[PDB]
Structure 1
Amino acid sequence: HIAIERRNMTLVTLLYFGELPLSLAACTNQLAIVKFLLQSVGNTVLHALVEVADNTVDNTKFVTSMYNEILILGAKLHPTLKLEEITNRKGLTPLALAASSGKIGVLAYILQREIHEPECRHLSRKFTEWAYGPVHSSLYDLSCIDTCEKNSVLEVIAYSSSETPNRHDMLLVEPLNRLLQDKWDRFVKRIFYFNFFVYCLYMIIFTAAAYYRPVEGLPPYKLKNTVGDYFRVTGEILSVSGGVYFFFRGIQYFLQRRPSLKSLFVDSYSEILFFVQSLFMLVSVVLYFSQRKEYVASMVFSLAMGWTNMLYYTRGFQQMGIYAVMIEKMILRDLCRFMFVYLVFLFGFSTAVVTLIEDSYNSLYSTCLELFKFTIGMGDLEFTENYDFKAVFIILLLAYVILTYILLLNMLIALMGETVNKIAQESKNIWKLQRAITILDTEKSFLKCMRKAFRSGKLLQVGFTPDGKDDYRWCFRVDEVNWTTW
């Protein structure tokens, strides 16, 4: 390993990048050294090379060349023995490890690799079926990447908590995009539209049952034999059954995803929404059967939540999905830090004025609301009059008006603009990540109808393997037109 450090083949022949000398010499980007040498962590040489990638053009070029040479050398050294199917200490394949790690160009290479050498056609991935003019008919296998039961690269990129840096920019490569469109427009689009109208009609039934709730007495109420009463009972039953579903789907989401506490609100914002919505529905029905008139309070929240929580489904549509992602970003970053700062100002001035006034229009609850109104421009500057020192009170409002209305809110608006301006293309692009998420969750819940489906499908035989036995895998055909190539 020490000789590998100095790139010395002499002492090597005499005899953090792992410990095996070949691993360090490969990590030191000395292909001749490992070629001469060959001829705990749990990471193989491929996994080590995946970890070594720095997503820069020179590092990616070196890593891809090293991996191509390693693939050729591995096929020569052992044709029957698996090379890519090996799993690291995490259990991930090296492709999966690179996908998790943040190797955009490396993953693009693995997806799009083709072998000029025919004997290197054993491990090649990209294939070309024909080329009439400038239009070539290409073929990508992508057999394991879509639907391997252990792990799938699509899954790994999907369940990425933004810690992977270019985790969004990964799937921009042609097979992932193309396959994503295929799955969507094949069946995921239609079932998501069915999802949309089921939930929309759910929210309408929940709204009608809520609006025409019965009031007389304290709950529960006797179910009188009447057409209206029968309708309201049936509507309540359908509503609470929907509620317990959006509990169960949500809780299995948390269980199967196992999200961290910090990643919770910064990735699964829609999920927490549809969890809290069902949670309020459950608390409402509990209080409805616990002999309390407060149930409707809980009920109201879920109802309000639910319609505002409908906006996820516009995350479906493209032109609306960007627009949804804006609201996600602002409720996560800006209107939390800003809302704390405005709480600092609000609390400071409200305690100031309440200490200034002596007598009960002055209470800190009422005074904060009264000072809150100024920000929306509905504040009445006249306020109260029982207080002494009119100048010392008025300077406090004028300070609060200059500060929190003009200085602070406007500044916040500028900060938001700084958000929309950077994310106009960015969130545009992000939309297709949530597109992919929904596409995967479709296979998720519909396990029975997705494995049989074989949405990727198109099993085309790879041919003669390095072992030399005829074998078949799954493929998918593309068209690439390049007049510049001729």
Structure 2
Amino acid sequence: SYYKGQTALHIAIERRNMTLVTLLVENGADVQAAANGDFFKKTKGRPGFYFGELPLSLAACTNQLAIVKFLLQNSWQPADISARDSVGNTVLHALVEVADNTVDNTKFVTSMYNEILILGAKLHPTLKLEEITNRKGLTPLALAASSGKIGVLAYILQREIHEPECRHLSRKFTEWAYGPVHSSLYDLSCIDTCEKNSVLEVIAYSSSETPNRHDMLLVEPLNRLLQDKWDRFVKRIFYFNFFVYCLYMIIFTAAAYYRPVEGLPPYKLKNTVGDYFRVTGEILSVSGGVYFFFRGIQYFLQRRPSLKSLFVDSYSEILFFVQSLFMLVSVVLYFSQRKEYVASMVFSLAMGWTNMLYYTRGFQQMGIYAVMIEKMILRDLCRFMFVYLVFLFGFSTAVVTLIEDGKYNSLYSTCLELFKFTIGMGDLEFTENYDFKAVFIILLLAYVILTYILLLNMLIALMGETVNKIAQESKNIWKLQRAITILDTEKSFAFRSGKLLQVGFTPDGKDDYRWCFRVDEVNWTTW
């Protein structure tokens, strides 16, 4: 079961001996046997090597160009080019699979991709290999986008072909050239709208598990597309949403600031203008809360996170949902004749005013600043808080054990007194109900030297280091955050670009249009 399925063709191809391959092919051995052994499976154990489960794929994935030429140009039994393995992957799918983002590996993978594409055009002009979709329902371009294969995606999105009867395969073109400036056209077929899966939505909605999700959008055409769509309509839509949220928060603040404070809600409606306005404001605030609650529900239903990216991705969505939950609990408590509705609503109010920071995206500098805040909270504050809490609790317990009796004989009071040192308000004499003054002073001085002088300054230093280290990463994360905003704005409910002619004739008689997107560049050398 482990090695089962292998045939002598596989061994001959592996050892890289042309003479033996030809001699074995003389007998007529089938060249379509699939090796289903677990060693040839994807990840069934640490030992193994996935190559597509066919001799053609094995040759393609192991620096065997002459061998694949032979297999595709042998009279006894020509090798099929569209063959699909058990997983559904073809030769191009396997080539995408074996890519691992290394300079030599990327160079070889792209070279073999191009060569096989040209050969397939030559033997089978009608057939188009780029549309063959594996059993997972993904084309090789979609597979490259999902898997994080930056090199393959970059090569595919902007390939050019300059040979007879196979120029139609190219994706970038050149509309015209004049002097040092020439205009190039990029094919937007299945990048922004595909109705099943496209490069943009595959990259944006990919889980955090994918390796290069941040760097994937830096490929030229994608950045140009995102900026174009933004400037076209998304900027105005986003500004309107930001304005509406500001108005909603202002209304909520005004309504909460003027609560009637009389005891045991609900409260009656006094016949006055101010009371009517207050009732209207609170109704509007509750409406906003329920709207956000429903939005969060449908987001969770649609994206359906893996139950672990919830704590790693979609922080904004969970924060907005928690705000809505606080508002709804506040309403329920209010109509149940309880005063804790005030506590719930103040928590919701503070959460909403902080969530105001979400709209910081859409402005480059402020977006970078917010991304930096998010990183800092995740790393530095967490580690600092763990160590600081340990120290504070230990020294608080020691001090409160020392004290005999009085106001500060409780753990909470002494913990608060010890914490006051951190904010520049420590007393050093807040009590005298102890038997030993030297022990008290030594404990307090040790706590001060350990936290205030050491840990806070080290936190400043580590923050400086992190700030030094995460600039480009912050910019890339901001770009991804804006791309997600653009895609969501489109989906909530514009087109790619102008239709144009590039080849004028496919291999067949009829011509084709492929929804191109123009880019202009200037060159001063290589005339």
CA–CA distance in structure 2, aligned partners of residues 62 and 134 of structure 1: 32
- Matched residue of 1:480: which SS? strand
CA–CA distance in structure 2, aligned partners of residues 344 and 241 of structure 1: 43
492, 496, 500: which one pairs with 1:445? 492
- Matched residue of 1:84: which SS? helix
Using a 3 Å threshold, how does the CA distance of structure 1 residues 348 and 132 change in structure 2: closer, same or farther? same
Do residues 27 (structure 1) and 61 (structure 2) align? yes
Residue 120 of structure 1 and its aligned partner are, at CA, apart by 2.1
CA RMSD of aligned residues (A): 2.1
Using a 3 Å threshold, how does the CA distance of structure 1 residues 382 and 484 change in structure 2: closer, same or farther? farther
Residue 199 of structure 1 and its aligned partner are, at CA, apart by 0.8
CA–CA distance in structure 1, aligned partners of residues 362 and 196 of structure 2: 28
Contact 1:315 1:325 in 2 (8 A): no
Contact 1:265 1:272 in 2 (8 A): no
Greater Rg by CA: 2
Residue 5 of structure 1 and its aligned partner are, at CA, apart by 2.2
- Matched residue of 1:383: which SS? coil
Using a 3 Å threshold, how does the CA distance of structure 1 residues 89 and 12 change in structure 2: closer, same or farther? farther
CA–CA distance in structure 2, aligned partners of residues 13 and 261 of structure 1: 54
CA–CA distance in structure 2, aligned partners of residues 235 and 9 of structure 1: 83
CA–CA distance in structure 2, aligned partners of residues 140 and 394 of structure 1: 73
Aligned length: 480
Residue 238 of structure 1 and its aligned partner are, at CA, apart by 1.1
Residues 356-389 of structure 1: per-residue CA shift (max 9 Å, x gap)? 2222423222222221221122222212211222
Residue 173 of structure 1 and its aligned partner are, at CA, apart by 1.5
Instruction: Give the corresponding residue for 1:335.
Output: 381
CA–CA distance in structure 1, aligned partners of residues 11 and 430 of structure 2: 79
Using a 3 Å threshold, how does the CA distance of structure 1 residues 88 and 338 change in structure 2: closer, same or farther? farther
Deviates more, 1:316-325 or 1:394-403: 394-403
Contact 2:52 2:91 in 1 (8 A): no
Using a 3 Å threshold, how does the CA distance of structure 1 residues 203 and 362 change in structure 2: closer, same or farther? same
Residue 462 of structure 1 and its aligned partner are, at CA, apart by 5.7
Residue 3 of structure 1 and its aligned partner are, at CA, apart by 2.4
Residue 19 of structure 1 and its aligned partner are, at CA, apart by 1.9
Residue 484 of structure 1 and its aligned partner are, at CA, apart by 2.5
Deviates more, 1:100-109 or 1:197-206: 100-109
Contact 1:135 1:481 in 2 (8 A): yes
Q: Give unmatched runs, 5+ long, in structure 2.
A: 1-9, 25-49, 73-84
What are the residue-to-residue correspondences of 1:302-451 with 2, within 5 Å?
Answer: 302-359=348-405, 360-446=407-493
Contact 1:7 1:25 in 2 (8 A): no
Deviates more, 1:265-274 or 1:56-65: 265-274
Using a 3 Å threshold, how does the CA distance of structure 1 residues 458 and 251 change in structure 2: closer, same or farther? farther
Residue 234 of structure 1 and its aligned partner are, at CA, apart by 1.1
Using a 3 Å threshold, how does the CA distance of structure 1 residues 406 and 81 change in structure 2: closer, same or farther? same
CA–CA distance in structure 1, aligned partners of residues 98 and 306 of structure 2: 26
Contact 2:501 2:512 in 1 (8 A): no
CA–CA distance in structure 1, aligned partners of residues 342 and 502 of structure 2: 62
The percentage of aligned residue pairs carrying the same residue is: 100
Contact 2:52 2:90 in 1 (8 A): no
Deviates more, 1:87-96 or 1:434-443: 87-96
CA–CA distance in structure 2, aligned partners of residues 54 and 312 of structure 1: 35
Using a 3 Å threshold, how does the CA distance of structure 1 residues 82 and 374 change in structure 2: closer, same or farther? same
Using a 3 Å threshold, how does the CA distance of structure 1 residues 317 and 91 change in structure 2: closer, same or farther? same
- Matched residue of 1:128: which SS? strand
Residue 101 of structure 1 and its aligned partner are, at CA, apart by 1.5
CA–CA distance in structure 2, aligned partners of residues 82 and 248 of structure 1: 45
Residues 195-235 of structure 1: per-residue CA shift (max 9 Å, x gap)? 11011111111111111122113222122332111111111
- Matched residue of 2:174: which SS? strand
Residue 460 of structure 1 and its aligned partner are, at CA, apart by 4.8
Using a 3 Å threshold, how does the CA distance of structure 1 residues 482 and 306 change in structure 2: closer, same or farther? same
- Matched residue of 1:189: which SS? helix
If the length of structure 2 is used for normalisation, what is the TM-score? Answer: 0.87
Deviates more, 1:236-245 or 1:454-463: 454-463
- Matched residue of 2:173: which SS? strand
Residue 464 of structure 1 and its aligned partner are, at CA, apart by 2.8
CA–CA distance in structure 1, aligned partners of residues 333 and 17 of structure 2: 76
Residue 318 of structure 1 and its aligned partner are, at CA, apart by 0.6
Using a 3 Å threshold, how does the CA distance of structure 1 residues 392 and 476 change in structure 2: closer, same or farther? same
CA–CA distance in structure 1, aligned partners of residues 348 and 496 of structure 2: 36
Using a 3 Å threshold, how does the CA distance of structure 1 residues 91 and 289 change in structure 2: closer, same or farther? same
Using a 3 Å threshold, how does the CA distance of structure 1 residues 353 and 456 change in structure 2: closer, same or farther? farther
Contact 2:500 2:516 in 1 (8 A): yes
Residues 72-92 of structure 1: per-residue CA shift (max 9 Å, x gap)? 122233333341222233322
Using a 3 Å threshold, how does the CA distance of structure 1 residues 390 and 238 change in structure 2: closer, same or farther? same
Contact 2:175 2:502 in 1 (8 A): no
Residues 107-128 of structure 1: per-residue CA shift (max 9 Å, x gap)? 1111111111132212210011
Residue 37 of structure 1 and its aligned partner are, at CA, apart by 1.5
Give the structure, 1 or 2, with the largest relative contact order (CA under 8 Å, sep 6 or more): 1
Deviates more, 1:38-47 or 1:215-224: 38-47
Using a 3 Å threshold, how does the CA distance of structure 1 residues 236 and 60 change in structure 2: closer, same or farther? same
Residue 391 of structure 1 and its aligned partner are, at CA, apart by 1.6
- Matched residue of 1:147: which SS? coil
Residue 159 of structure 1 and its aligned partner are, at CA, apart by 1.5
Using a 3 Å threshold, how does the CA distance of structure 1 residues 3 and 282 change in structure 2: closer, same or farther? farther
Residue 160 of structure 1 and its aligned partner are, at CA, apart by 2.9
Deviates more, 1:394-403 or 1:259-268: 259-268
If the length of structure 1 is used for normalisation, what is the TM-score? Answer: 0.94
CA–CA distance in structure 2, aligned partners of residues 240 and 134 of structure 1: 61
Residue 33 of structure 1 and its aligned partner are, at CA, apart by 1.6
